[PDB]
Design a protein around this nucleic acid. Structure first.
Ligand SMILES: Nc1nc2c(ncn2[C@H]2C[C@H](O)[C@@H](COP(=O)(O)OP(=O)(O)OP(=O)(O)O)O2)c(=O)[nH]1
Ligand SMILES: [Ca+2]
Ligand SMILES: [Ca+2]
Ligand SMILES: [Ca+2]
Ligand SMILES: [Ca+2]
Length: 342
DNA sequence: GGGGGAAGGATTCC
DNA sequence: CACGAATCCTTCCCCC
């Protein structure tokens, strides 16, 4: 069958910051996203393991991080930089297999089925790849290897950080019955709970439930997905993913429902969005708002043609107005998203 | 009954 | 509650 090798870069953003300023190694490093509402308002994008040991991780408020680690190194997120480093590493991987799926800024899958035979050679190829990336970009990564993408990923999670692991056909059979359903990619907290209310704590448990009831609880796609995995039949092909949308969203100094007060933020979002679009022309635009109670509302429109900067501006305000008149809540974050590229 | 789209929301965290 | 992008779901709507 198919042999998949998954690469996931270790504590990536923070590690890139270490590569660019080596003295940082050994010290707790936290990459922050400062919202500008107040001094250290915002959240953590990621932290290195020195910092994670004490509970400082992605998603917690920067303020909470500083209470725990007042003397750690706090850096503003520099996405562009991390993206360029990522691209280079992806190019190196692209040399080990043409069948590659760049799943995100820091992970990719390679179909090495006709590149090696048996897991042994696969394992050796993983070490070659780890060594090559460490040598070329001084970045440590974790390799996951199995028969399909979901398990290759799971193997990497199990080997984090700077590890490599193979989950052979026998171990998969074991995991299908031993693994906590919540540790399965695609199963967030909302799905974990529904599956719990169904008596489904492991993958195998999805086989002892009437499909119709499963489908009714979590949806058909997710249901067929889990059953497929449980039947040891999951086998999605590794394929090139293409960017389908580009957008920007900013946090406003203060929460507001005032149009003239919100426009500047919206227009700044549009400007960045367009620059990032580069030479892409979208036919669809969506105005996205995050309300005072962290809920997310959006309004959009598809055009029978490409959207120009002027159009985007004009339309953005109409969609923003539609949002204000339709949701009595104050707006905290405002932005845009362009999709359906020509 | 059913295709095809579009819109807005749900969920994931890749 | 203290920060970008993909996929899937429900609800409409138009119409063969
Ligand atoms: N802004 C923001 N960025 C995130 C968040 N989560 C992840 N990222 C970014 C920065 C992370 O370094 C990068 C890769 O995510 P990972 O889940 O693989 O974590 P990282 O690679 O940081 O740690 P790891 O060694 O894989 O456990 O994506 C988040 O919650 N907010
Ligand atoms: Ca990673
Ligand atoms: Ca990752
Ligand atoms: Ca989970
Ligand atoms: Ca994550």
């Amino acid at each position: 069958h198919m042999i998949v090798l998954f690469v996931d870069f270790d504590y990536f953003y923070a590690q890139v910051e270490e590569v660019l300023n080596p003295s940082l190694k050994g010290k707790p490093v936290v990459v922050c996203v400062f919202s500008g509402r107040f001094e250290d308002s915002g959240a953590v994008a990621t932290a290195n393991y020195e910092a994670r040991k004490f509970g400082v991780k992605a998603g917690i408020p920067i303020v909470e991080a500083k209470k725990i680690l007042p003397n750690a190194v706090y850096l503003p997120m520099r996405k562009e930089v991390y993206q360029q480093v990522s691209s280079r590493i992806m190019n190196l991987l692209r040399e080990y297999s043409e069948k590659i799926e760049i799943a995100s800024i820091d992970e990719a899958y390679l179909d090495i089925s006709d590149k090696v035979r048996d897991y042994r050679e696969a394992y050796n190829l993983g070490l070659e790849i780890k060594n090559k990336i460490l040598e070329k970009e001084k970045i440590t990564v974790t390799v996951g290897i199995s028969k399909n993408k979901v398990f290759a990923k799971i193997a990497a999670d199990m080997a984090k950080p700077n590890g490599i692991k193979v989950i052979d056909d026998e171990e998969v059979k074991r995991l299908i019955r031993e693994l906590d359903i919540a540790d399965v990619p695609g199963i967030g907290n909302i799905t974990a709970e529904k599956l719990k209310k169904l008596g489904i704590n492991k993958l195998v448990d999805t086989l002892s439930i009437e499909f119709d009831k499963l489908k009714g609880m979590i949806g058909e796609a997710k249901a067929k997905y889990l059953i497929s995995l449980a039947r040891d039949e999951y086998n999605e092909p590794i394929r090139t993913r293409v960017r389908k949308s580009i957008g920007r969203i900013v946090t406003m100094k203060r929460n507001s429902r005032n149009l003239e007060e919100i426009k500047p933020y919206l227009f700044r979002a549009i400007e960045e969005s367009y620059y990032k679009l580069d030479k892409r022309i979208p036919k669809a635009i969506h105005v996205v708002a995050v309300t005072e109670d962290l809920d997310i509302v959006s309004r959009g429109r598809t055009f029978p043609h490409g959207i120009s900067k002027e159009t985007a501006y004009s339309e953005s305000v109409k969609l923003l107005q539609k949002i204000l008149e339709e949701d009595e809540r104050k707006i905290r974050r405002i932005g845009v998203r362009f999709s359906k590229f020509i």
